[PDB]
Design a binder for this molecule. Structure first.
Ligand code: DB8
Length: 266
């Protein structure tokens, strides 16, 4: 046991937020004062330090644009205790009521924050393995954080967000996260629309290997789709860094699209 462990008696499992093939997610209260969120094991569901190795990644990672670990439980019943994100998933946020008021400036800045989280990941020498809008939590003031490193690792599988070399040959790198970041960029600019519309997994895998790439989403600037294309380069090592992507997006509206005017959607 380590210093990340707490008494479970500390924990008010209150409202329910979701389920899965893993367990649940709950709003709750920690030591009576603190709002938290808990990813649960409903008793047996799966392996101990499989559920509890997303902790071992999340313990050593610690950035403002990453969802924060608060504590863990193995005094079974079992829990992963984390920082509570008020507006839920970026996917739900984009599809929901506020989604449609979202404009490029907002969307680019969300992209930015995420780039920022991932750039930290990048210099910590970790890989996320599952980057996509569904694993981005939104809080107040349009804040976005990376969450659910649930497969993550030191650099020692829903394929539409997955880089070819990673889906096919299991080559997961920060460079394959980048690939996913570019796909994540199509989600933001379409307001949550599933990538590769009308295509099934195997068809996506076959067309992407022949070099098919998603075209510029409607009302999305060419400069922003260029960036997605860079993120989707065949050779992993030619994809840009999260550091370049972070700085590119923060500076976007001055350095890159300094003449942008809003349309009916973006
Ligand atoms: C702890 O373990 C993990 C937990 C999570 N999941 C969450 C964490 C975290 N972290 C924090 N806070 C969350 C808040 C949620 O909903 C709150 C508000 C929802 N509404 C949207 C619609 N409007 C109009 C009302 C508000 C939520 O919904 C499912 C999931 C959350 C992930 Cl993604 C990964 C890991 Cl590893």
């Amino acid at each position: 046991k380590d210093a990340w462990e707490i008494p479970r008696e500390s924990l008010r499992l209150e409202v329910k937020l979701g389920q899965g093939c893993f367990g649940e997610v709950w709003m709750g209260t920690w030591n009576g004062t603190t709002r938290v969120a808990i990813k649960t094991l409903k008793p047996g569901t799966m392996s101990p330090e499989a559920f509890l190795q997303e902790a071992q990644v999340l313990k050593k990672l610690r950035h403002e644009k990453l969802v924060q670990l608060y504590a863990v439980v193995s005094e079974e019943p079992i829990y992963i205790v984390m920082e509570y994100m008020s507006k839920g998933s970026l996917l739900d946020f984009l599809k929901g009521e506020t989604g449609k008021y979202l404009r490029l400036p907002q969307l680019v800045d969300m992209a930015a924050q995420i780039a920022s989280g991932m750039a930290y990941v990048e210099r910590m020498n970790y890989v996320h393995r599952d980057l996509r809008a569904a694993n981005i939590l939104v809080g107040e003031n349009l804040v976005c954080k990376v969450a659910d490193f649930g497969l993550a690792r030191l650099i020692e599988f829903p394929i539409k967000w997955t880089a070819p070399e990673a889906a096919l040959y299991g080559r997961f790198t920060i460079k394959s996260d980048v690939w996913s970041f570019g796909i994540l960029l199509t989600e933001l600019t379409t307001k949550g629309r599933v990538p590769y519309p009308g295509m099934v997994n195997r068809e996506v895998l076959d067309q992407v290997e022949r070099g098919y790439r998603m075209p510029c989403p409607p009302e999305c600037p060419e400069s922003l789709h260029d960036l997605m294309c860079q993120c989707w380069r065949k050779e992993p090592e030619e994809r840009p860094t999260f550091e370049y992507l972070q700085a590119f997006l923060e500076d976007y509206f001055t350095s890159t699209e300094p003449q942008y005017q809003p349309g009916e959607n973006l």
